[PDB]
Amino acid sequence: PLSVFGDRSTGETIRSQNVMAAASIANIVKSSLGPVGLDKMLVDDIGDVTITNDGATILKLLEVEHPAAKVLCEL
Amino acid sequence: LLQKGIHPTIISESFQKALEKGIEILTDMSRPVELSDRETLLNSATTSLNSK
Amino acid sequence: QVKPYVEEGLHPQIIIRAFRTATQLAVNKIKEIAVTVKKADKVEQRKLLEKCAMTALSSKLISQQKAFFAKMVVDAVMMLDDLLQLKMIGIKKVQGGALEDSQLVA
Amino acid sequence: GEKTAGINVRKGGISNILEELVVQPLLVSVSALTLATETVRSILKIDDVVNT
Amino acid sequence: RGKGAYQDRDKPAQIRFSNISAAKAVADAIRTSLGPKGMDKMIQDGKGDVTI
Amino acid sequence: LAGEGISVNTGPKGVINDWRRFKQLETEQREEQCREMERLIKKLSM
Amino acid sequence: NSGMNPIQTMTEVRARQVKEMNPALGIDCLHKGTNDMKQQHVIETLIGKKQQISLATQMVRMILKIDDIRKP
Amino acid sequence: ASLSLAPVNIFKAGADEERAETARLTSFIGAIAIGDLVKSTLGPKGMDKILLSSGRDASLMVTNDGATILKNIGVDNPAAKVLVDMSRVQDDEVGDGTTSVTVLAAELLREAESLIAKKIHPQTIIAGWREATKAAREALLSSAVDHGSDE
Amino acid sequence: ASLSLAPVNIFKAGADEERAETARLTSFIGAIAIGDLVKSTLGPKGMDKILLSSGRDASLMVTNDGATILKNIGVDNPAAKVLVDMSRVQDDEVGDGTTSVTVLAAELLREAESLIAKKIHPQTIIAGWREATKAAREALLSSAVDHGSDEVKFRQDLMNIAGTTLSSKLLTHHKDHFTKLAVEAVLRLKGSGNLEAIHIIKKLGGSLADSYLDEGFLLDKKIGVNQPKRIENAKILIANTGMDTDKIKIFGSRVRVDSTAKVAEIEHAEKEKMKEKVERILKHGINCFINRQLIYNYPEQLFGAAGVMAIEHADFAGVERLALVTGGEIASTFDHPELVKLGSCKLIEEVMIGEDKLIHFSGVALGEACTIVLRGATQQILDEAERSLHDALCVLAQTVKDSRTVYGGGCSEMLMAHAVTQLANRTPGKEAVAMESYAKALRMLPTIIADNAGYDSADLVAQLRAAHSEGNTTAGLDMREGTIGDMAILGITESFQVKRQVLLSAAEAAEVILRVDNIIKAAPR
Numbered sequence A: 001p002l003s004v005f006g007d008r009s010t011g012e013t014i015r016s017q018n019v020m021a022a023a024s025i026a027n028i029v030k031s032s033l034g035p036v037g038l039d040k041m042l043v044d045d046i047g048d049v050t051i052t053n054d055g056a057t058i059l060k061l062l063e064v065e066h067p068a069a070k071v072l073c074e075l
Numbered sequence B: 001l002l003q004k005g006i007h008p009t010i011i012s013e014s015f016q017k018a019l020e021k022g023i024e025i026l027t028d029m030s031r032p033v034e035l036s037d038r039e040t041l042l043n044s045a046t047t048s049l050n051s052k
Numbered sequence C: 001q002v003k004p005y006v007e008e009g010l011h012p013q014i015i016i017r018a019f020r021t022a023t024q025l026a027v028n029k030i031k032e033i034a035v036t037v038k039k040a041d042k043v044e045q046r047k048l049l050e051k052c053a054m055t056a057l058s059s060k061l062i063s064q065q066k067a068f069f070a071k072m073v074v075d076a077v078m079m080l081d082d083l084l085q086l087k088m089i090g091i092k093k094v095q096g097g098a099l100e101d102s103q104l105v106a
Numbered sequence D: 001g002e003k004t005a006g007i008n009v010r011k012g013g014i015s016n017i018l019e020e021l022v023v024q025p026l027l028v029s030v031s032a033l034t035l036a037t038e039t040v041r042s043i044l045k046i047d048d049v050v051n052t
Numbered sequence E: 001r002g003k004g005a006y007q008d009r010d011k012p013a014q015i016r017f018s019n020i021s022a023a024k025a026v027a028d029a030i031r032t033s034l035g036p037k038g039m040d041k042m043i044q045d046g047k048g049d050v051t052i
Numbered sequence F: 001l002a003g004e005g006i007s008v009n010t011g012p013k014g015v016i017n018d019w020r021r022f023k024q025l026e027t028e029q030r031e032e033q034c035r036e037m038e039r040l041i042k043k044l045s046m
Numbered sequence G: 001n002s003g004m005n006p007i008q009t010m011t012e013v014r015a016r017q018v019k020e021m022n023p024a025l026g027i028d029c030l031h032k033g034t035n036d037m038k039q040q041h042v043i044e045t046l047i048g049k050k051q052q053i054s055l056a057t058q059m060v061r062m063i064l065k066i067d068d069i070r071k072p
Numbered sequence H: 001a002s003l004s005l006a007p008v009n010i011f012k013a014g015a016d017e018e019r020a021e022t023a024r025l026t027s028f029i030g031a032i033a034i035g036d037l038v039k040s041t042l043g044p045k046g047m048d049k050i051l052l053s054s055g056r057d058a059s060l061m062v063t064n065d066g067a068t069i070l071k072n073i074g075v076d077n078p079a080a081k082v083l084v085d086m087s088r089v090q091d092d093e094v095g096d097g098t099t100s101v102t103v104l105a106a107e108l109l110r111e112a113e114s115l116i117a118k119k120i121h122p123q124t125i126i127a128g129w130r131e132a133t134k135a136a137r138e139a140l141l142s143s144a145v146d147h148g149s150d151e
Numbered sequence I: 001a002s003l004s005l006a007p008v009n010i011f012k013a014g015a016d017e018e019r020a021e022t023a024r025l026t027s028f029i030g031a032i033a034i035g036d037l038v039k040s041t042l043g044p045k046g047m048d049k050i051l052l053s054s055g056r057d058a059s060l061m062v063t064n065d066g067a068t069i070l071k072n073i074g075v076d077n078p079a080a081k082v083l084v085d086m087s088r089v090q091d092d093e094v095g096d097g098t099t100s101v102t103v104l105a106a107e108l109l110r111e112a113e114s115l116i117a118k119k120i121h122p123q124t125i126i127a128g129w130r131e132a133t134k135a136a137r138e139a140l141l142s143s144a145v146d147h148g149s150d151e152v153k154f155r156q157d158l159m160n161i162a163g164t165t166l167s168s169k170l171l172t173h174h175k176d177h178f179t180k181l182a183v184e185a186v187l188r189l190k191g192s193g194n195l196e197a198i199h200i201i202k203k204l205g206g207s208l209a210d211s212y213l214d215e216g217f218l219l220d221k222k223i224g225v226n227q228p229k230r231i232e233n234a235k236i237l238i239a240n241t242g243m244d245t246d247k248i249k250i251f252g253s254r255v256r257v258d259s260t261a262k263v264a265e266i267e268h269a270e271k272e273k274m275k276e277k278v279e280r281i282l283k284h285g286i287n288c289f290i291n292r293q294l295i296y297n298y299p300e301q302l303f304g305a306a307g308v309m310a311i312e313h314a315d316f317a318g319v320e321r322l323a324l325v326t327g328g329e330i331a332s333t334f335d336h337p338e339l340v341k342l343g344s345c346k347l348i349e350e351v352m353i354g355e356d357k358l359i360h361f362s363g364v365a366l367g368e369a370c371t372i373v374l375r376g377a378t379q380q381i382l383d384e385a386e387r388s389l390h391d392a393l394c395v396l397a398q399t400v401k402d403s404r405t406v407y408g409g410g411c412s413e414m415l416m417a418h419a420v421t422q423l424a425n426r427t428p429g430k431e432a433v434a435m436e437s438y439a440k441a442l443r444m445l446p447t448i449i450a451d452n453a454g455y456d457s458a459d460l461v462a463q464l465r466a467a468h469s470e471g472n473t474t475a476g477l478d479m480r481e482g483t484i485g486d487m488a489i490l491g492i493t494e495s496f497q498v499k500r501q502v503l504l505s506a507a508e509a510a511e512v513i514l515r516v517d518n519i520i521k522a523a524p525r
């Protein structure tokens, strides 16, 4: 019918997908909050290590695909 | 309309007649407005922005 | 409903105990407030069975004829003696015909 | 006889919308009607597709 | 006048129906984004560009 | 065997989705083969 | 299928049926000059029509009730 | 909407479907091809055909019989299959007339194609052909001469 | 023997060859396919076509013109190529009749195929067709009428011809308005035969009836920064000079000094040269300056200081159109102000069309150049409107050049075929059969015209044949209600040149295609 060259998600499916992406981004850095938080080791598949606790740095280094997760990273 | 057996040229002319009548109806339904009436302009802009 | 408490580190044993207690209380409440008739009147039992069958059937593609099928099902069940064996109620499917054409053979 | 009766989303029903300040210029409905009708006529005057 | 003209080809009818179906599908696509209670759509093009 | 002027007509516009689906992968491989062409046999023999 | 205009012929036949109480007026497919199927001896069994309507209604309901498809 | 020109696909892989004008075109092409193949073997000056087999045997067969020609060929056009079966049944019923009946059917279908091109409903053509066949049958029966009495 | 069916192979790999029956079958199949495809878009009730390109951009084109349909398709049948090029040449000669000539050639070749099946040598068919073409041409010439002497009669004939031309196209929804528009646009040419003097601007948005012929002229350029946006009693100078870092055309020259002070002096000298050129331009006493090439920052500022409009980068077509509409002279030197003519118009200003801005030249002096604004809902609609308007303008220009006219609606074809039949039944041999086939194709043309409308084409064509045989030489297909009518009263007229060209081109293409008995294809690259 539409004959559009691509995928389409409508209704609760896309909303659940967006919420899943946002929740995954939140759970990435939830463990580094508060004084009892702990840092993270980040390796860029070349041998460079970035030990960091900053949420902005963690979200910047990671390569992300979903648009909502990208929205949270830019936030 | 086509499945009922109407040639797709009577349909076009009938749609044109309906369009002319509809333009007449909409024109009769309208209300004059002046640019000095700031309230109407604000209402129009708000109505435009309501869906965004 | 218990996912948010799980995410915040609540011990699952507490959730299990709460579920068990709530379920026991709910089952006891259901047994307490359930409606029963202490007369064994044949007409009353017939109507009760028919209403239960209609309620069960009123979600399927035969919900339009739920009264017909409910009466037929009650009639079929009442002629089983004591064991109510499913294999003693044959079901035959013959292609072609309206739903109302279905019949119960005595 | 209610010329301005429209769908009200604030109260979830139907009422006069001029009191809800929901107005639009005439050259939105008129333009949409004319363009849509003319496009429909143009589409109706079509009976084949050719690939180059 | 009796039997009348016989539609020999019948392919123009198929073309018209296909065009109508495509237009109706497009409208149903952009049908839920209309009015104040309409939601937005997110479009990701062939590149990484994203627009809501 | 007549009608060699087929003029497929309506056929493509209803199947261009699948046609482009195959064409995308064909092009994706095509960059690889075109790139490796400039080395694999461009000057191997000489 | 007989070449006549569908909407016009159907409307005329329905109007004639409404005017005079005569449910035998149909579509003169063979162009015999009259719409009276009783005079034209176009006869069908009642059971056939009843089964047609019943089966069509039940299958339309069954198709309408389906809302999920899970092909592999 | 057509069974093939629809947004949804309703067929198995490889299934085909040809609507009014396409099906008529295929049927007429097959019929005309069969008629033009079987003809030129008709009449006192008709010539023969060579039927080379594509199988392992590769048997050679030269013949003037229309039914023999139509039997040992690879036919995929279904209307051509109908004409071939007509010729075979005609051969079974009586010895002669296979080429004549095949050519007559081909010419009738060519005239039908012309009439359809002239915007004439096929049912009208069929009714006219029924009346024409009745008249021709009556005339041919009246023209018959019987000599069974005299030895 | 034959090249292909020989024990030894005489060809390269991929080369092919087709003998008599096979080549004839291929040619006839291609011609009939082309004719069937182009037809059903013929006559007032013909429908349009969708040309969906297979390229990367996949350009979409909705059209009714036979030439545009035929040129924008992948044609591999050589006979189809011949027919396509015939249609293209017909379009080049006159703007209308491509579909008619294509269908006539296809019907002629169909009749030729029938005659060949009837065991008639092709040369006999060619001779019969030559005789039939001569007879039909003589009949058409004898049937023509001329009204160029009478001004009002010629105006009415032009209106009728424009209406007939636009009847088949999409503009039939507003045929009257568009006919008046096209007639006025052509009449404003003052007899000049150049259609490039008529500019068609396609602006999206608005109804198709919003299109209008501008009383002046519209330019899609822009004015400088500090120049007036509106002037009264314009005195326009049209120029074709550089006005952009103007370099002396001594290519080998260069600046060689020993100090930057000398370089600054030379830079000031160049600026002074440009200023002196601008002063020489201003010595003409002008208000608006139109240059074909770009105007750089310094000359634009100099013009702004003098309060003179400076429209830049108006291409060759633009400067030619301004010269035609205002009477100016396209100059390139400004040392003789008294030997140049300045264009004049009542008013120049900027107008808003859609969301864009254009320069409006109102109250022009000569006005022998038109701009037509086209409004539509889709780009395809605008393109088709432009094509239809181009057809109308071409036909009107041809009628202005040659005022002889013939009646359309099948009347001309029917009288041609009646003359062909009159010649045929008087000639012995199979040439009579060939001429009868020629007349049959000529009959089939209005037959297809009536089929496209869904009418009873057989009965109408029989009635037309009877009327033309009796002596009613003006009978034709009245498509208002599906009867026959008098094309003199009904006002259905077509150019004599268009009809003659269609007939002759169709006969020529049929003759050249029919002569072929062997097709040989080289190995494709």
Ligand SMILES: Nc1ncnc2c1ncn2[C@@H]1O[C@H](COP(=O)(O)OP(=O)(O)O)[C@@H](O)[C@H]1O
Binding pocket: B047, B048, B050, B051, B052, D007, D008, D009, D022, D024, E033, E034, E035, E036, E038
């Ligand atoms: N507050 C509102 N209450 C009711 N209807 C509204 C309101 N705001 C906008 N609309 C209606 O919604 C319609 C669609 O407008 P919108 O959704 O902005 O997209 P578009 O203007 O492109 O159709 C308008 O015709 C308008 O009448």
Ligand SMILES: Nc1ncnc2c1ncn2[C@@H]1O[C@H](COP(=O)(O)OP(=O)(O)O)[C@@H](O)[C@H]1O
Binding pocket: H041, H042, H043, H044, H046, H066, H096, H097, H098, H099, H100
């Ligand atoms: N001596 C003849 N003179 C004229 N016609 C003949 C003669 N012999 C046969 N025919 C014609 O040839 C036609 C075809 O006959 P033939 O090819 O032998 O068998 P079939 O009837 O199977 O085609 C017959 O219809 C007959 O009329």
Ligand SMILES: Nc1ncnc2c1ncn2[C@@H]1O[C@H](COP(=O)(O)OP(=O)(O)O)[C@@H](O)[C@H]1O
Binding pocket: I041, I042, I043, I044, I046, I066, I096, I097, I098, I099, I100, I163, I164, I165, I166, I167, I168, I169, I408, I409, I410, I449, I477, I479, I492, I494
């Ligand atoms: N209003 C009309 N009434 C009758 N015949 C018409 C009318 N308009 C056009 N025709 C006929 O249709 C034929 C084709 O014209 P048209 O489709 O406009 O251009 P083309 O010649 O390129 O096909 C012409 O020969 C003309 O005689």
Ligand SMILES: [Mg+2]
Binding pocket: C055, C056, C057, C059
């Ligand atoms: Mg249940």
Ligand SMILES: [Mg+2]
Binding pocket: I096, I097, I164, I165, I166, I168, I391
């Ligand atoms: Mg034309």
